[PDB]
């Protein structure tokens, strides 16, 4: 106990990292560079697996920085105990498609990505680089009792 | 203890079911067949009540399959201890209204619903059938202390 | 133990309040009157700080009433232990921008705000008043072990 196993599935993966000693969440990094157009969905790969013990659940969830600044919305993922597969970050660019163009992609701090080669993108598009802090994993204990069907409650 | 009471409110309701032994969430089924147009909201009825004991909270939340494949977004519901009412799934079709038509509704796996009778729908519309796994209930313990107002923290 | 410190940062702030004895969440009030146009984002200030102890995490999250009735979407905030700063409610008006006008703002119950002075707003705009129940704080215990890297899991 007091030990969580972590299995890196690739060279692109990075070990989960906790910001402070007091903090609750382990920050999670992307294993791939992805461009998301307005309204576009994706399951961004972490290339990290973990073995959550029985009587616990992981919460692969958004960071307040990224979610407040940008229209990148991560749907909180309920990481089951025993799931040793690749942790996917369930993400959607929730910026509106207003049929407008721009030479600037946007980073995860909602800042213009300057670049030498000029390219037209859809306005509201974002780019997430390889190995950026876009999510965090918070583990909490769970209650998994037997279900007893009843006609009325005892209270 | 180690027992959760479940009260079926209708013939349309189904008993909550856990997928595996190791898993954290009890999968929840719809009690009604619903069509959601783009941007349309609803509180889909489960027709299941539960008695969560004191010192716990239920999390009626999305499944990673349905949320990744489709624009159906369930807002996680905080199920209080003692709430013996009908569990509503708080859902919105977050697909954009782009003023386009199609003969195909979409199922919860983002697949075309073929049908003999031809009908025009709005593009991005979904249909959820009676008794489909669209949500899951994860129960976690909670901390409910007394609040003491202070001018500064003791740390 | 069984005591949470709460520090009001302003006269506009209100003490967090639990609805019932059995309930899990402490309801949180806005410290500022804010108008959110369609698609507009904000970090609405509570002007309340709290000292969550070690081995716990706060969940600053939406209420089922406000989220079901309106397109106001609060992204659940993961409140770390030791964070003594101002609690921001991470909110976005997820109503579509359909380029239409109206004389009516909308309140957090999705009801028309009548007013003597006539003003044109964008359709789907909301207003949140000073000191309205728009969020709730649920505290849960957490598991914060050491991470051990491994080539394969022990199971
Ligand atoms: O965001 C997520 C969510 C889940 N997952 C993984 C972890 C979890 O153990 C597994 C199953 O989660 P769900 O039960 O919520 N998905 P679903 O019920 O649709 O599929 P399954 O049939 O596997 O339960 O998917 C992710 O990688 N990312
Ligand atoms: O998605 C949900 C969320 C909540 N609920 C139920 C369970 C819970 O016990 C009850 C109250 O939850 P909230 O406190 O979050 N809603 P609100 O604070 O707006 O209303 P109330 O005055 O009842 O607290 O609503 C659902 O059925 N589905
Ligand atoms: O909705 C929120 C979410 C977080 N917070 C505060 C509480 C928490 O202690 C602090 C940090 O939360 P995150 O770790 O999720 N944000 P991020 O990882 O982007 O920044 P940091 O570098 O501070 O970790 O922000 C809010 O006030 N409102
Ligand atoms: Mg962090
Ligand atoms: Mg499942
Ligand atoms: Mg409440």
CA A70 to chain CA centroid, Å, is 14
Nearest chain A residue to B141 by CA: give it. A142
- Nearest alpha carbon to residue C80 among A65, B145, A73: A65
Write down the experimental method used for this entry: X-ray
Q: Which of B24, B39, B144 should one mutate to test binding to chain C, selecting the residue with the greatest count of C CBs within 10 A? A: B144
- B39 vs B95: CA distance, rounded Å: 6
Per the structure, the complete domain to which residue A108 belongs is given by 1-155
What are the angstrom distances between the C-alpha of A118 and each of A83, A106, A112, C25? 43, 14, 13, 50
* Among protein residues, the one whose CA lies closest to atom 16 of ligand 1: B64
- Chain A positions touching B67 (Cβ under 8 A) are 75, 90
In chain A, how many domains are there? 1
Residues of C within an 8 Å Cβ radius of B: 1-8, 15-16, 18, 20, 22-26, 49, 51, 56, 61-62, 64, 67-68, 71, 73, 76, 82, 84, 94, 96, 98, 136, 138-141
Task: Enumerate residues 6+ apart whose C-beta is below 8 A from C53.
Answer: C1, C81
Q: Within 13 Å and on the Cβ side, how many CA atoms surround C30?
A: 20
Question: DSSP readout, C94-118?
Answer: -S---S-EES-EE-TTS-EE--SS-
Chain centroid to CA C39: 17
B136 CB-contact burial (10 Å; exposed 0-12 / middle 13-18 / buried 19+): buried
DSSP secondary structure code for residue A95 in this structure: S
CB-count exposure of residue B101 (10 Å: 0-12, 13-18, 19+): exposed
| Integer Cα distance of A9 and A15 in angstroms | 11
* CA–centroid distance, residue A45 to ligand 6 (Å): 36
State the CATH number of the domain containing residue A125.
Answer: 2.70.40.10
CA B28, CA B48: separation in Å to the nearest integer? 9
Which residues lie closer than 8 Å to B47 by C-beta, 6 or more apart?
Answer: B8, B9, B10, B12, B13, B31, B86
Query: How, if at all, do strands B3-8 and A146-149 pair?
Result: parallel
- Chain A residue numbers with beta carbons less than 8 Å from the beta carbon of B71 are 41, 92
Q: Report the C-alpha gap between B40 and B103 in whole angstroms.
A: 19
For the beta carbon of residue C118, count every other beta carbon within 10 angstroms: 6
Distance from C-alpha of A31 to C-alpha of A37, rounded to nearest angstrom: 19
The secondary structure element, H or E, covering residue A116 is none
End-to-end CA gap in chain C:
38
Structure tokens belonging to residue B69 = 């494949």
Among all bound ligands, the one having the nearest atom to the CA of C79 is 3
Distance, in Å, from the CA atom of B16 to the CA atom of B133, rounded to the nearest integer, reads 10
The helix or strand, by DSSP H or E, that contains position B109, with its residue range, turns out to be none
Chain A residue at shortest CA distance from B136: A78
H or E element at residue C66? helix C64-69
- Tell me whether strands A77-79 and A88-93 are parallel, antiparallel or unpaired: unpaired
Strands B3-8 and B48-51 come out as antiparallel
Instruction: Tell how far the Cα of C25 is from the centroid of ligand 2, in angstroms.
Output: 10
Say how far apart CA A74 and CA A66 lie, in whole Å: 10
Q: For residue C53, give the nearest of C81, C30, C78 by alpha carbon.
A: C81
How far is the CA of B85 from the CAs of B50, B88, C119, in angstroms? 8, 9, 41
Rounded distance, CA C104 to CA C89, Å? 25
Q: What are phi and psi of B22, to 5 degrees?
A: -75, -25
Instruction: Kindly give, in sequence order, each residue whose CB lies less than 8 Å from that of residue A53, ignoring residues fewer than 6 positions away.
Output: A1, A81
Q: 3-state class of B149 per DSSP? A: strand
Which ligand has an atom closest to residue B82 CA? 2
Residues A114 and A131: their CA atoms lie apart, in Å, by: 19
Contacts of A90 in chain B (CB under 8 A): 64, 67-68
Q: Are the C-beta atoms of A150 and B7 separated by less than 8 Å?
A: yes
Do you know the residue count of chain A? Answer: 155
């Amino acid at each position: 106990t007091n030990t969580l196993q972590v299995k890196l599935l690739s060279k692109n993966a990075r070990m989960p990292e906790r910001n402070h000693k007091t903090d609750a969440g382990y920050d999670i990094f992307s294993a791939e560079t992805v461009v998301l157009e307005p309204q576009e969905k994706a399951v961004i790969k972490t290339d990290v697996a973990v073995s959550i013990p029985e009587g616990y659940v992981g919460l692969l969830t958004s960071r307040s920085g990224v979610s407040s600044k940008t229209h990148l919305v991560i749907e909180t993922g309920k990481i089951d105990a025993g799931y040793h597969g690749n942790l996917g970050i369930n993400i959607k660019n929730e910026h509106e498609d207003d049929k407008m163009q721009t030479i600037f992609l946007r980073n995860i701090d909602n800042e213009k990505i300057f670049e030498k080669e000029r390219h037209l993108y859809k306005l509201g598009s974002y780019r997430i680089e390889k190995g950026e802090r876009i999510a965090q994993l918070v583990i909490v204990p769970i209650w998994t009792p037997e279900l007893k069907q009843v006609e009325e409650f005892e209270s």
